[PDB]
Amino acid sequence: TKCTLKSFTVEKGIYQTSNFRVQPTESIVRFPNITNLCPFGEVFNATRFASVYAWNRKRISNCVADYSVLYNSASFSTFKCYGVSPTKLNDLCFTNVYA
Amino acid sequence: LTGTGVLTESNKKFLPFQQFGRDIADTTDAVRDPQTLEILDITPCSFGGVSVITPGTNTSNQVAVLYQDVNCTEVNVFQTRAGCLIGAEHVNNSYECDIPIGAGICASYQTSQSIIAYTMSLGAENSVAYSNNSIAIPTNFTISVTTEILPVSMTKTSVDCTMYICG
Amino acid sequence: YTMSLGAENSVAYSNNSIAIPTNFTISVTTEILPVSMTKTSVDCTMYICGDSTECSNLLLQYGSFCTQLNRALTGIAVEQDKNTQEVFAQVKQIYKTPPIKDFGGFNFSQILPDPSKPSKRSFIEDLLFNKVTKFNGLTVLPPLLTDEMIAQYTSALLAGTITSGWTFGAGAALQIPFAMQMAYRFNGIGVTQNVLYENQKLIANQFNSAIGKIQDSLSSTASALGKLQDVVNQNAQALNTLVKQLSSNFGAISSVLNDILSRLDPPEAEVQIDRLITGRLQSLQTYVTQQLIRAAEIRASANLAATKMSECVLGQSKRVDFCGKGYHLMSFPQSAPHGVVFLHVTYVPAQEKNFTTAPAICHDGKAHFPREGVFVSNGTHWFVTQRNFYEPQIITTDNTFVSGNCDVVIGIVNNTVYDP
Amino acid sequence: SALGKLQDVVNQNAQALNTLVKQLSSNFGAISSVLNDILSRLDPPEAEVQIDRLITGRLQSLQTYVTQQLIRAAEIRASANLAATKMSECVLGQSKRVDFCGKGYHLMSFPQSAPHGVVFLHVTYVPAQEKNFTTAPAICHDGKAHFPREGVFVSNGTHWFVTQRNFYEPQIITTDNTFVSGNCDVVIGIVNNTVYDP
Numbered sequence: 064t065k066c067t068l069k070s071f072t073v074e075k076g077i078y079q080t081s082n083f084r085v086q087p088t089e090s091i092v093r094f095p096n097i098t099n100l101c102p103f104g105e106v107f108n109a110t111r112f113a114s115v116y117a118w119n120r121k122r123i124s125n126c127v128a129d130y131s132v133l134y135n136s137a138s139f140s141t142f143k144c145y146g147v148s149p150t151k152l153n154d155l156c157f158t159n160v161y162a
Numbered sequence: 163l164t165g166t167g168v169l170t171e172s173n174k175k176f177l178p179f180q181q182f183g184r185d186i187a188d189t190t191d192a193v194r195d196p197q198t199l200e201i202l203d204i205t206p207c208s209f210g211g212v213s214v215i216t217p218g219t220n221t222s223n224q225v226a227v228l229y230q231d232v233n234c235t236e237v238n239v240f241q242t243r244a245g246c247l248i249g250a251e252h253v254n255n256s257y258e259c260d261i262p263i264g265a266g267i268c269a270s271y272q273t274s275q276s277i278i279a280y281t282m283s284l285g286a287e288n289s290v291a292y293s294n295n296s297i298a299i300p301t302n303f304t305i306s307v308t309t310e311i312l313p314v315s316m317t318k319t320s321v322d323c324t325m326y327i328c329g
Numbered sequence: 330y331t332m333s334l335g336a337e338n339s340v341a342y343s344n345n346s347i348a349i350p351t352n353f354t355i356s357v358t359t360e361i362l363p364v365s366m367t368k369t370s371v372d373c374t375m376y377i378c379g380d381s382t383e384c385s386n387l388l389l390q391y392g393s394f395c396t397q398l399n400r401a402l403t404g405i406a407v408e409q410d411k412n413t414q415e416v417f418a419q420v421k422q423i424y425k426t427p428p429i430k431d432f433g434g435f436n437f438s439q440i441l442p443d444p445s446k447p448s449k450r451s452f453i454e455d456l457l458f459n460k461v462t463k464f465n466g467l468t469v470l471p472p473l474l475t476d477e478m479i480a481q482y483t484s485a486l487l488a489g490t491i492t493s494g495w496t497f498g499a500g501a502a503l504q505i506p507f508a509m510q511m512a513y514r515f516n517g518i519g520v521t522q523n524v525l526y527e528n529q530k531l532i533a534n535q536f537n538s539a540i541g542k543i544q545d546s547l548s549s550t551a552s553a554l555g556k557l558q559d560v561v562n563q564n565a566q567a568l569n570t571l572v573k574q575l576s577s578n579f580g581a582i583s584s585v586l587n588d589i590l591s592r593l594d595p596p597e598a599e600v601q602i603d604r605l606i607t608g609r610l611q612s613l614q615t616y617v618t619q620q621l622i623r624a625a626e627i628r629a630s631a632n633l634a635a636t637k638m639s640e641c642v643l644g645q646s647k648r649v650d651f652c653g654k655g656y657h658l659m660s661f662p663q664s665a666p667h668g669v670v671f672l673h674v675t676y677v678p679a680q681e682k683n684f685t686t687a688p689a690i691c692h693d694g695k696a697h698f699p700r701e702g703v704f705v706s707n708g709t710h711w712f713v714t715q716r717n718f719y720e721p722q723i724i725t726t727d728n729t730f731v732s733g734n735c736d737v738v739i740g741i742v743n744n745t746v747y748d749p
Numbered sequence: 750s751a752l753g754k755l756q757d758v759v760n761q762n763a764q765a766l767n768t769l770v771k772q773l774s775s776n777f778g779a780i781s782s783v784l785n786d787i788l789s790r791l792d793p794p795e796a797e798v799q800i801d802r803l804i805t806g807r808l809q810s811l812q813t814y815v816t817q818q819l820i821r822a823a824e825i826r827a828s829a830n831l832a833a834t835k836m837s838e839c840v841l842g843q844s845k846r847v848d849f850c851g852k853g854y855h856l857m858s859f860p861q862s863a864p865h866g867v868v869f870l871h872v873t874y875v876p877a878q879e880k881n882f883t884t885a886p887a888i889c890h891d892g893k894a895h896f897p898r899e900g901v902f903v904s905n906g907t908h909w910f911v912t913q914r915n916f917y918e919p920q921i922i923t924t925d926n927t928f929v930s931g932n933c934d935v936v937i938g939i940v941n942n943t944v945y946d947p
């Protein structure tokens with residue numbers, strides 16, 4: 064109450080000073096149980112690439128995506144993300160991924 | 163999708179293509195467990211305002227705490243319709259309202275002294291001796307003087323908007 | 330179509346004709362006033378930054394914007410109880426009616442508390458309550474005075490008015506027969522008490538019928554309480570708007586704070602959060618401002634209701650149309666959801682005759698004027714009668730006074746004045 | 750506490766100004782709440798952005814202050830109008846309005862000035878002591894029903910008197926105190942007595 068009123072003296076009455084909230088005790092993490100690794104190797108490290116007018120699209124579905132290798136590898140000259148951050152990517156699910 | 167809340171069983175019949183539910187505020191209402199296809203309601207972890215009922219610090223540092231619109235569960239405990247009141251002694255005797263709590267309940271600092279809570283009195287009971295052929299006529303009178311205080315004006319402030327914003 | 334401005338009715342005005350009512354009706358009207366509004370309270374921190382430490386830390390950069398809104402809402406919540414207290418808690422004691430309802434033929438069973446209910450409310454109060462009908466830091470506080478306590482206060486005021494007239498308002502409740510109370514109320518409107526006593530059965534029957542009509546109106550016309558239903562609707566609408574504002578983006582990539590925090594690093598999340606904080610803080614400021622303006626309107630209405638209670642229920646009003654159309658006799662308060670309903674019992678002239686009049690009568694050259702009332706002629710004989718009710722009396726020296734002579738008063742006519 | 754209604758007004762205005770002054774310490778998203786520290790550190794292309802953020806925050810703060818002042822001023826104006834009404838219909842005249850000028854039957858009022866307000870001393874007449882008297886709506890004499898011109902009929906158990914409603918002052922019932930209307934067969938509860946003819 065003293066902090067709420069910014070004073071060391073509190074006048075007689077009833078004051079609303081805070082809000083009671085039962086804090087959580089533990090975290091619950093749920094994900095589909097699957098051990099497949101997403102084939103990021105054969106997309107980046109492929110021998111031959113397609114021309115930009117006929118750019119090749121690959122569909123990634125139903126696999127555990129290990130994005131650590133990507134931002135941890137230093138071969139790449141350009142690495143820029145939009146709409147999401149690389150650090151918060153490893154802990155994030157997607158319906159589909161398109162490469 | 164992350165958040166904090168109590169996960170409970172539900173009777174919400176989600177369609178096979180629906181994975182998440184939302185409330186009016188666009189927050190998550192329920193989820194389908196990705197491992198077992200059941201619908202779980204997400205109820206934000208209970209909460210409510212906290213009010214401190216206290217006599218002035220020039221008298222005593224004892225306080226009572228009112229947890230607004232909650233049950234005396236998740237939190238000398240008195241459950242009222244205003245919330246769960248902890249620290250105030252419940253007294254059967256009524257008195258005039260001092261520090262209002264709500265829902266007819268008021269609190270005060272009284273007797274050795276402590277904070278008490280009670281249902282406030284509305285006034286003394288006084289029946290009128292009514293009958294069809296009896297009239298009461300005053301035989302004496304008193305001249306009384308009362309004080310009525312009214313605001314008329316308020317401080318005539320003026321703010322230099324340019325100097326205030328860009329001094 | 331072009332609306333009509335009521336029916337056209339010319340008055341048969343002339344310089345020597347007066348219309349005096351020969352009959353009257355007792356009417357009961359309903360005046361409904363808002364008294365209080367929902368005591369909302371918003372946790373500005375939980376609303377803006379719910380369960381997010383980063384958002385809260387950004388919110389701290391706006392200083393007192395949060396706590397001054399909590400203060401403004403507290404001020405409103407407090408004045409809502411002040412308004413209720415000022416309207417209903419005007420009696421120092423709790424009065425109760427006698428077990429025998431010997432009120433001269435006046436039936437009050439429909440406005441007095443019904444001891445058989447779980448809450449001692451009147452029948453009409455029950456009718457009124459049956460017509461008027463989250464987790465984001467938005468709460469509603471209960472009123473300080475519960476519905477039962479309001480019903481008890483209206484019961485005390487009604488029992489006082491019925492058994493002691495206006496004496497309980499000024500001081501102590503002084504018992505008086507109800508018929509005599511009405512006799513005083515009639516004298517207060519310029520109608521001699523003998524009219525009440527001679528027609529007591531008719532007046533009581535008209536009163537009972539008017540009350541039955543009030544019950545039928547409240548029981549059948551839902552719109553009768555619109556002034557109070559709109560208040561409930563306005564507060565519900567305000568809260569729904571505030572809640573809907575949480576779904577807005579305000580320029581952010583997403584309205585959901587957790588979806589921003591789980592996707593962007595601090596250097597970008599802080600910008601998106603600042604955008605949401607600005608939007609939600611502006612939304613709260615708009616809500617609070619609307620609540621302050623509406624609260625000021627409600628306060629003005631509550632002050633009007635308190636004025637009517639004091640000068641209408643506890644006393645007798647000489648103010649025209651302050652307490653309903655007609656000559657005010659008495660009023661009865663009733664509680665209602667977030668408001669008060671007054672049943673105003675008034676005297677309205679009902680039937681009239683065309684009489685010839687004169688400002689004065691000559692007798693021996695003296696000009697005689699009425700002490701009270703006016704002179705009337707039915708075409709052959711002159712009488713003096715009270716202005717608001719035809720009751721012809723012989724013109725005598727105890728009804729009139731002499732001032733001046735026949736050569737001064739314009740329109741004076743010749744007659745005789747009986748000397749008892 | 751007797752003057753709380755006026756002390757609160759001073760406090761409310763002081764609080765509004767103190768809030769406004771405290772608002773100068775907020776960053777509103779800027780690197781610093783102090784404008785000179787922004788100007789002394791950033792070039793115009795960045796200083797203008799930080800300044801726009803501070804201007805937006807401080808302008809919103811002023812708008813909030815002004816809105817609160819307009820609402821409070823409207824409340825004060827309504828109170829002042831009520832005070833003027835009481836002054837005119839209470840001090841300058843005599844109020845017939847029940848409880849408009851204090852509890853009781855209003856006699857007179859006296860104005861007093863006060864800081865940012867007015868205090869009225871209302872002098873009222875309040876009945877103090879009462880006795881239980883028997884009453885009747887009318888008295889029969891020769892078959893005529895006599896009603897009081899002013900006051901009511903009372904009986905102490907043996908004799909009937911007429912007295913003013915608000916103060917016990919028994920007088921002999923005479924033809925100069927009552928009037929005749931109708932007869933004994935109409936008024937419910939009429940009692941027998943005698944009417945003195947002076």
Ligand SMILES: *[C@@H]1O[C@H](CO)[C@@H](O[C@@H]2O[C@H](CO)[C@@H](O)[C@H](O)[C@H]2NC(C)=O)[C@H](O)[C@H]1NC(C)=O
Nearest residue numbers: 300301302303304305875876877878879916917
């Ligand atoms: C009306 O009441 C007043 C007081 O309320 C009476 O005045 C008192 O009378 C007694 C005599 O019995 C004195 O001893 C007191 O000193 C008086 N008080 C004051 C303030 O003067 C007054 O006598 C009563 N009148 C009647 C007719 O009984």
Ligand SMILES: *[C@@H]1O[C@H](CO)[C@@H](O[C@@H]2O[C@H](CO)[C@@H](O)[C@H](O)[C@H]2NC(C)=O)[C@H](O)[C@H]1NC(C)=O
Nearest residue numbers: 351352353354355530531532534535538679680
């Ligand atoms: C005054 O008006 C009332 C009704 O407005 C009259 O009461 C009615 O009188 C008729 C007889 O003419 C009865 O048949 C009705 O039943 C009465 N109604 C009620 C409710 O009692 C009353 O008679 C009129 N008086 C005068 C003198 O005209």
Ligand SMILES: *[C@@H]1O[C@H](CO)[C@@H](O[C@@H]2O[C@H](CO)[C@@H](O)[C@H](O)[C@H]2NC(C)=O)[C@H](O)[C@H]1NC(C)=O
Nearest residue numbers: 430431432434435436437438439452537540541
């Ligand atoms: C006052 O009016 C009520 C109804 O408006 C009367 O109550 C009725 O009494 C009759 C018996 O004569 C019953 O048959 C009805 O069912 C009652 N109705 C209700 C709603 O209670 C009451 O008796 C009247 N009081 C007087 C003294 O006449």
Ligand SMILES: *[C@@H]1O[C@H](CO)[C@@H](O[C@@H]2O[C@H](CO)[C@@H](O)[C@H](O)[C@H]2NC(C)=O)[C@H](O)[C@H]1NC(C)=O
Nearest residue numbers: 682685705706707708709710711712721722723
């Ligand atoms: C005007 O009123 C007077 C007084 O009532 C009427 O005079 C009476 O008329 C009746 C006839 O119905 C006679 O029986 C009475 O003897 C008359 N009394 C007196 C003192 O004259 C008079 O007729 C009325 N005139 C009109 C036009 O209504």
Ligand SMILES: *[C@@H]1O[C@H](CO)[C@@H](O[C@@H]2O[C@H](CO)[C@@H](O)[C@H](O)[C@H]2NC(C)=O)[C@H](O)[C@H]1NC(C)=O
Nearest residue numbers: 690691692693694695735736740741742743744
């Ligand atoms: C009322 O009576 C008076 C007298 O009692 C009338 O006065 C007469 O007026 C005429 C016209 O001027 C004179 O010739 C008479 O001499 C007057 N009478 C007397 C006794 O001097 C008066 O006109 C009468 N008015 C009406 C309307 O009848």
Ligand SMILES: *[C@@H]1O[C@H](CO)[C@@H](O[C@@H]2O[C@H](CO)[C@@H](O)[C@H](O)[C@H]2NC(C)=O)[C@H](O)[C@H]1NC(C)=O
Nearest residue numbers: 882883903904905906907908909910919920921
């Ligand atoms: C009612 O008041 C009358 C009027 O004073 C009382 O009659 C008087 O009583 C006294 C006794 O104290 C006698 O001395 C008077 O002569 C009586 N006067 C008359 C005109 O009767 C009467 O006694 C009172 N009764 C009660 C019950 O108080």
Ligand SMILES: *[C@@H]1O[C@H](CO)[C@@H](O[C@@H]2O[C@H](CO)[C@@H](O)[C@H](O)[C@H]2NC(C)=O)[C@H](O)[C@H]1NC(C)=O
Nearest residue numbers: 888889890891892893933934938939940941942
């Ligand atoms: C008041 O006095 C009158 C007489 O002046 C009483 O009238 C009598 O009533 C009885 C019963 O009906 C008759 O038998 C008598 O003949 C009536 N007297 C006369 C002279 O006609 C009347 O009852 C009295 N009322 C009260 C309440 O005492």
Ligand SMILES: *[C@@H]1O[C@H](CO)[C@@H](O)[C@H](O)[C@H]1NC(C)=O
Nearest residue numbers: 104105107108109110136138
């Ligand atoms: C890519 O594949 C070739 C096989 O031709 C292998 O030698 C090389 O090490 C691979 N690089 C990475 C980064 O996996």
Ligand SMILES: *[C@@H]1O[C@H](CO)[C@@H](O)[C@H](O)[C@H]1NC(C)=O
Nearest residue numbers: 072073074218219220221222
């Ligand atoms: C505190 O209470 C004492 C009485 O014990 C009084 O003298 C003193 O002035 C009070 N102080 C304040 C700030 O009210």
Ligand SMILES: *[C@@H]1O[C@H](CO)[C@@H](O)[C@H](O)[C@H]1NC(C)=O
Nearest residue numbers: 231232233234235241242243
């Ligand atoms: C609190 O919970 C108990 C059961 O645990 C229940 O009986 C009681 O009515 C509840 N009170 C409120 C105010 O919800």
Ligand SMILES: *[C@@H]1O[C@H](CO)[C@@H](O)[C@H](O)[C@H]1NC(C)=O
Nearest residue numbers: 251252253254255256279280
């Ligand atoms: C108050 O009275 C009730 C009976 O109505 C009783 O059950 C209760 O124990 C009493 N409590 C106290 C503190 O006296």
Ligand SMILES: *[C@@H]1O[C@H](CO)[C@@H](O)[C@H](O)[C@H]1NC(C)=O
Nearest residue numbers: 340341342348681682683684
């Ligand atoms: C009084 O006279 C006017 C003259 O126009 C007439 O219309 C009216 O009906 C008359 N009143 C009665 C009661 O006859």
Ligand SMILES: *[C@@H]1O[C@H](CO)[C@@H](O)[C@H](O)[C@H]1NC(C)=O
Nearest residue numbers: 343344345687688739740741
């Ligand atoms: C009323 O007016 C008419 C004509 O306007 C006039 O002849 C008559 O004398 C007037 N009556 C009175 C009492 O003035």
Ligand SMILES: *[C@@H]1O[C@H](CO)[C@@H](O)[C@H](O)[C@H]1NC(C)=O
Nearest residue numbers: 290291292298878879880881
């Ligand atoms: C009048 O009689 C009633 C009977 O209940 C009594 O209570 C009351 O005190 C009496 N009046 C006075 C002034 O004593």
Ligand SMILES: *[C@@H]1O[C@H](CO)[C@@H](O)[C@H](O)[C@H]1NC(C)=O
Nearest residue numbers: 293294295429431937938939
């Ligand atoms: C007053 O009521 C009693 C019983 O309630 C009755 O006996 C008496 O006659 C009534 N008096 C009048 C004047 O109606």
